[PDB]
From Swiss-Prot, chain A:
Binds to host ACE2. RBD also interacts with the N-linked glycan on 'Asn-90' of ACE2. Cleavage of S generates a polybasic C-terminal sequence on S1 that binds to host Neuropilin-1 (NRP1) and Neuropilin-2 (NRP2) receptors. Interacts with host integrin alpha-5/beta-1 (ITGA5:ITGB1) and with ACE2 in complex with integrin alpha-5/beta-1 (ITGA5:ITGB1). May interact via cytoplasmic c-terminus with M protein. May interact (via N-terminus) with host bilirubin and biliverdin, thereby preventing antibody binding to the SARS-CoV-2 spike NTD via an allosteric mechanism. Residues 1-8 are annotated as: Immunodominant HLA epitope recognized by the CD8+. Changing F8L: In strain: Omicron/EG.5.1. Residues 1-50 are annotated as: Receptor-binding motif. Attaches the virion to the cell membrane by interacting with host receptor, initiating the infection. The major receptor is host ACE2. When S2/S2' has been cleaved, binding to the receptor triggers direct fusion at the cell membrane. When S2/S2' has not been cleaved, binding to the receptor results in internalization of the virus by endocytosis using host TFRC and GRM2 and leading to fusion of the virion membrane with the host endosomal membrane. Alternatively, may use NRP1/NRP2 and integrin as entry receptors. Residues 7-42 are annotated as: Disordered. Disulfide bonds join C32-C40. Changing Y5F: In strain: B.1.1.298. The chain holds residues 449 to 498 of 1273 of the full protein. This is Spike protein S1. Changing N12K: In strain: Omicron/BA.2.75, Omicron/BQ.1.1, Omicron/XBB.1.5, Omicron/EG.5.1. Changing F38P: In strain: Omicron/XBB.1.5, Omicron/EG.5.1. Changing F38V: In strain: Omicron/BA.4, Omicron/BA.5, Omicron/BQ.1.1. It comes from Severe acute respiratory syndrome coronavirus 2.
Length: 50, 50
């Protein structure tokens, strides 16, 4: 589980740009205010490498 | 669960925002597609297993 990918982001990346900010993403109309839950997901998902 | 009900969905436009608007759904987990990009994609072979 050491390898993760950014599933959620507000906008696309530029060429050769790196994003390591672990801020919450607002996937719905309701604000998240830094707390995950309904319509609030962490942007980073871990690969199930087996 | 051994006789799970399968329904084919075709020839319509599906608004997935109303699924989030009224939602007693505790678990909402999507594997191969983003939950917020469902309204921006076109699909077929849509099957609901209840």
């Amino acid at each position: 589980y050491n390898y993760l990918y950014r599933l959620f982001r507000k906008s696309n990346l530029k060429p050769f740009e790196r994003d390591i900010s672990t801020e919450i993403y607002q996937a719905g109309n309701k604000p998240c205010n830094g707390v995950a839950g309904f319509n609030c997901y962490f942007p980073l998902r871990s690969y199930g490498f087996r | 669960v051994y006789a799970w009900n399968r329904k084919r969905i075709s020839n319509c436009v599906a608004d997935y925002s109303v699924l989030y608007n009224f939602a007693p759904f505790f678990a909402f987990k999507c594997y191969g597609v983003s939950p917020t990009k469902l309204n921006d994609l076109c699909f077929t072979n849509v099957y609901a297993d209840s």
